[PDB]
Amino acid sequence: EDPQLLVRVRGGQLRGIRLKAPGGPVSAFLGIPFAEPPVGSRRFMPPEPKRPWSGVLDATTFQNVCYQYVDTLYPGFEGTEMWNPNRELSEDCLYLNVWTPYPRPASPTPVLIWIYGGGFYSGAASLDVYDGRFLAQVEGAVLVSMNYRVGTFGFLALPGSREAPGNVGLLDQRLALQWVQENIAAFGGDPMSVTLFGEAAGAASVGMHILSLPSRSLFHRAVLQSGTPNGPWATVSAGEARRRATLLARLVGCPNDTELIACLRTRPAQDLVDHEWHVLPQESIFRFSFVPVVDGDFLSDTPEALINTGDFQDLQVLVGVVKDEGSYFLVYGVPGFSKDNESLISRAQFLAGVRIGVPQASDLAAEAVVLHYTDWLHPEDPTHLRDAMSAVVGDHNVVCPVAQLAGRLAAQGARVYAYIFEHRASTLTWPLWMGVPHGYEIEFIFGLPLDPSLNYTTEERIFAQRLMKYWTNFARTGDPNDPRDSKSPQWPPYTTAAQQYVSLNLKPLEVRRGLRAQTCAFWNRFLPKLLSAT
C-alpha cells in the first residue's frame, strides 16, 4: 500500500491509483461519490449529500456515465465516438474525479474544476479529452471533474412543483463545488483558490454559477470556453419547460404535478431518452430539449437581465471562441451538409438552412439574416454559401453571445480576457471545410499532445504547453500572463472601449480589436428589435 494514495475525506477513507504521465507520476482518485445515487424516488430531485462509508473505498476507476442519449449519426467514426459515453450508462452517476501531483503537494495548490458540455443532454467527466493527468504533472495543478445529470434526469422541470423543481443538474454541480471546499485540502488543494472552467454547455453552467448567489461562495475565477449563460439555447422560460415536460409525459403515457411526476418515475430510463428529441417546438439545430430553466430561484431572472444588472467587480473571467463554431452542427439537420463530401450548397439550400439555424426567426428576420451574410459580389458561389451557413450558426449561438457577455462583465467592473482559437489539430478526423470545429481546443488545453503515442506534431506539443500555462496562470492569479517572463506582446484585458482579444494559434500572440463587432451588432442590437415587432 502506497501511503500517498490514501486519503481521509469527511465521509471516510479512499484509495487512489498512481498513473504515469510522460514527465512523471500523478495521483488519481477516480469515481468518488459526492451524493446519494439520484434513483427511484430521488429522480428529478435536488441531490442529497452522500452518507459516510466504512473501510477503504476503492477510487482507482471511473464510475458510470449519467444516463443520456447516445449518438448514432456516424457509427464507429472517431470524430463522434470521442464524445460518446466510454463507461456504462446508469442513473447512479453522481461521482467526481481528482488528479494531483505525486507526491501530494507540500503547500495548498490552486484548484481547477472542469464542467463538461454536451448540450445539457450528454457528456461525462471520464472522456479521454478531459484527462487531468497532464495539467497535474506539468503545472502542479489539482484538477477536479464531476458527473452531473443530463437530459430529462437533470433538467426536466415542472416549475413550482416540489417533486421536479428544475435545474437539478446544476445543483449536482453545486454539490461537487461544496465537496471541493469541504475536502480538497486533504488532497493538498487550496479551497481559497478555485477556478471553474468548462466548454459549451459546461461554459454556460460556469456562467450560471456566476449568476447564482449561493454558488458564488464556492469559487473565485471562471473560464467560459465557447458557451454562455445568455443566448438562444442555454435557458428556457418556466412556461416553456412546463410545456415540454408535460408533452414528454404524454409521449410516454403519463399520467396535478404530483400525479404526473410519480408516473414519470415508474418509467425505465431509456423510455424517457427515446422521446427526448420529440418535444422541440421547431425543426432546429443547436437546440436542446431539457436545459436550465428560469425558475426565479437558482436563476432569479433571465441571464440577460442578470448580466445587465450585476456587480462583477471582484471577478476575473477568461472567455473565448474557436474559429468555426457552427460547422459541427450543420451535419445534424441542415439539408446539403455531410462530413463525407465538400458540402457545397445552393442559395435555395442556404435560405432553408437559415430557417432551421434561426428557428425563432420570422420571415422578415430570416431574410435580414440572409441579406446580411450573402456576399453580393458572389451571391451564388457554393463555397461562400457553405461557409456563411456555418458562420450564421456559430455567430448566433456562440460568438455573439460571448461578445455580449464579455462586454457586460467588463462594463460591470469585472476583469475579462478574451480569445479566438485558430489552430486545427493535425489529427482531426472531420473534413477540412469544417476548419476548427466546436470542441477541438479542449484536447490542447488539457495537454494531450504531450503524450507522444497520440501522434501530434512537435509544434503542437509546444503550443499545448503555452495554453496549459495561460490557463493555470489565470487560475493562480486571475491573469493569464507569465508573471516573471518578459516579452511583449502581453495579453491585454478585454474592455468595452478597446475590445482587445488575442488569437491562439501556432504563431506568437496577436492582439486584435473587436470580436465580430459589426456582425454582432446585427445579432445583439438589431435583430431583437425586429422580433419585438415581428
Ligand X SMILES: CCCC(=O)SCC[N+](C)(C)C
Residues 312-351 that bind ligand X (CB under 6 A): 329, 332
Tell me if 93 sits within 8 A of 176, measured CB to CB.
no
Tell me if 356 sits within 8 A of 368, measured CB to CB.
no
Nearer to ligand X, 179 or 523 (CB): 523
In angstroms, the CA 301 to CA 347 distance is 40
Tell me if 56 sits within 8 A of 412, measured CB to CB.
no
Residues 363-382 that bind a copy of itself (CB under 8 A): 364, 367-368, 371, 374, 376-377
Q: Rule CB under 8 A: is residue 514 a binding residue for a copy of itself?
A: yes
Q: Residue 377 binds what, of a copy of itself, ligand X, none (CB under 5 to 8 Å, by partner type)?
A: a copy of itself
In angstroms, the CA 422 to CA 400 distance is 17
In angstroms, the CA 287 to CA 73 distance is 17
Q: Residue 499 binds what, of ligand X, a copy of itself, none (CB under 5 to 8 Å, by partner type)?
A: a copy of itself
Question: Shortest distance, CB of residue 257 to a copy of itself, whole angstroms?
Answer: 41
Beta strand pairing call for 142-146 and 95-101: antiparallel
Position of cell 461557409?
Answer: 387
What is the size of the binding site for a copy of itself (CB under 8 A)?
Answer: 20
Nearer to a copy of itself, 4 or 524 (CB): 524
Q: Residue 387 binds what, of ligand X, a copy of itself, none (CB under 5 to 8 Å, by partner type)?
A: ligand X
Q: Rule CB under 8 A: is residue 351 a binding residue for a copy of itself?
A: no
Tell me if 162 sits within 8 A of 80, measured CB to CB.
no
Residue 50 DSSP SS3: coil
Q: Rule CB under 6 A: is residue 526 a binding residue for ligand X?
A: no
In angstroms, the CA 492 to CA 19 distance is 37
| Contact region with a copy of itself (CB under 8 A), list: 276-284, 339-347, 415-423, 523-531 | 523-531
Alpha helices in 415-526 (DSSP H): 442-445, 458-477, 517-521
Q: Rule CB under 6 A: is residue 303 a binding residue for ligand X?
A: no
Nearer to a copy of itself, 506 or 521 (CB): 521
Question: Shortest distance, CB of residue 87 to ligand X, whole angstroms?
Answer: 20
Could you say which of 48, 128, 214, 277 contacts ligand X (CB under 6 A)?
277
Sequence-distant (6+) residues with CB within 8 A of 496 are 407, 410, 411
Q: Residue 400 binds what, of a copy of itself, ligand X, none (CB under 5 to 8 Å, by partner type)?
A: none
Nearer to a copy of itself, 7 or 515 (CB): 515
Q: Rule CB under 8 A: is residue 530 a binding residue for a copy of itself?
A: yes
In angstroms, the CA 229 to CA 209 distance is 9
Residue 79 DSSP SS3: helix
Closest CA to 442 of 419, 468, 461, 406: 468
Nearer to ligand X, 99 or 430 (CB): 430
Q: Residue 514 binds what, of a copy of itself, ligand X, none (CB under 5 to 8 Å, by partner type)?
A: a copy of itself
Residues 376-435 that bind ligand X (CB under 6 A): 387, 432-433, 435
Nearer to ligand X, 3 or 76 (CB): 76
Tell me if 323 sits within 8 A of 267, measured CB to CB.
no
In angstroms, the CA 293 to CA 299 distance is 8
In angstroms, the CA 284 to CA 301 distance is 26
Contacts with ligand X by CB under 6 A lie at 277, 329, 332, 387, 432-433, 435
Contacts with a copy of itself by CB under 8 A lie at 364, 367-368, 371, 374, 376-377, 499, 513-514, 517-518, 520-522, 525-526, 529-530, 533
